[PDB]
């Protein structure tokens, strides 16, 4: 009664890339510099308004630590969308993207949508992955791409809005 659509979204990617911070910025417009790893999985709910429709988002923030790989992967079932995040200052996190893609292909719905996100783009002096490299990989994968900053609120809303739109279109 209260919404027109309800989408389960997951934020996945290596530990420390900024997944919790991404959700904190989107939902609460807040940021902390503290790094406290997520245990298991957590979620927030947010309702957005798009094309005179009410879209309820149930957004799951997954732990990136390998210790929680199995329990977070159990929640891929039923997800309509994924934010697949790496950190532009962490080459390992970028190298891990194909493995995350395989995990999505294995444990999610065939028609689940995916956006690749290179976070921490404010950290230009520590950057090791260029924008162009991120976009190149996204195009090889056939997915949309954004660089973001949870810290300075760059493109965070844009990612969620685009993900809602491509899920809606795929329907
Ligand atoms: N400069 C900068 N720091 C960021 C940004 N996003 C997150 N951080 C910092 O990166 C660290 C890890 O962030 P966090 O959101 O906890 O990462 P996570 O991906 O949720 N880690 P985990 O998978 O272990 O739960 C924190 O110190 C946080 O302040 C960003 O856009 N820019
Ligand atoms: Mg976290």
Q: CB 2: neighbour CB atoms within 10 A?
A: 7
b/e code 134-169 from CB counts within 10 Å (16+ = b) = bbebbeeeebbbbbbbbbeebbbeebbebbbebbbe
Count of domains for the chain: 1
For residue 1, give the nearest of 60, 59, 54, 63 by alpha carbon.
Answer: 54
Q: Which two tokens stand for residue 82?
A: 């994924």
Which residue's CA is minimally distant from atom 29 of ligand 1? Answer: 33
Q: Which two tokens stand for residue 163?
A: 């993900």
Q: Which of 10, 17, 18, 86 to mutate to test the pocket of ligand 1 (most atoms within 8 A of CB)?
A: 18
Q: Which two tokens stand for residue 17?
A: 């890339």
Ligand with an atom nearest the CA of residue 25 = 1
- Complete DSSP assignment for the chain: ---SEEEEEEEEESTTSSHHHHHHHHHHS-------PPPSEEEEEEEEEETTEEEEEEEEEE--SGGGHHHHHGGGTT-SEEEEEEETT-HHHHHTHHHHHHHHHHHS-TT-EEEEEEE-TT-GGG--S-HHHHHHHHHHHT-EEEE-BTTTTBSHHHHHHHHHHHHHHH-
Spacing, Cα 20 to ligand 2 middle (Å): 4
The CATH number for 47's domain is 3.40.50.300
Let me know the angle formed at the C-alpha of 57 by 24 and 108, rounded to the nearest 5 degrees: 100
- In terms of Cβ atoms closer than 10 Å to its own Cβ (0-12, 13-18, 19+), residue 33 is exposed
- How far apart CA 171 and CA 155 sit, in angstroms, is 24
- How far apart CA 149 and CA 169 sit, in angstroms, is 26
Domain containing 151 equals 1-171
**Protein residues with C-beta less than 5 angstroms from the ion ligand 2:** 19-20, 38
The phi and psi torsions of 144 (rounded to 5 degrees) equal: -65, 160
- How far apart CA 89 and CA 38 sit, in angstroms, is 20
The response to whether residue 25 sits with its C-beta less than 6 Å from ligand 1 reads no
Let me know the angle formed at the C-alpha of 161 by 159 and 162, rounded to the nearest 5 degrees: 65
The response to whether residue 35 sits with its C-beta less than 6 Å from ligand 1 reads yes
């Amino acid at each position: 009664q209260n919404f027109d659509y309800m989408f389960k979204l997951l934020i996945i990617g290596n530990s420390s890339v900024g997944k919790t911070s991404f959700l904190f910025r989107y939902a609460d417009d807040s940021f902390t510099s503290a790094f406290v790893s997520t245990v298991g999985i957590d979620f927030k709910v947010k309702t957005v308004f798009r094309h005179d429709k009410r879209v309820k988002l149930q957004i799951w923030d997954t732990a990136g630590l390998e210790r929680y790989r199995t329990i977070t992967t159990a929640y891929y079932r039923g997800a309509m969308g994924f934010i697949l995040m790496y950190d532009v200052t962490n080459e390992d996190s970028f190298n891990s993207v194909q493995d995350w893609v395989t995990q999505i292909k294995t444990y999610s719905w065939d028609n689940a949508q995916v956006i690749l996100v290179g976070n921490k783009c404010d950290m230009e002096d520590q950057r090791v992955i260029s924008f162009e490299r991120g976009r190149q990989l996204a195009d090889q994968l056939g997915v949309e791409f954004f660089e973001t900053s949870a810290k300075e609120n760059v493109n965070v809303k844009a990612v969620f809005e685009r993900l809602v739109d491509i899920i809606c279109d795929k329907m």
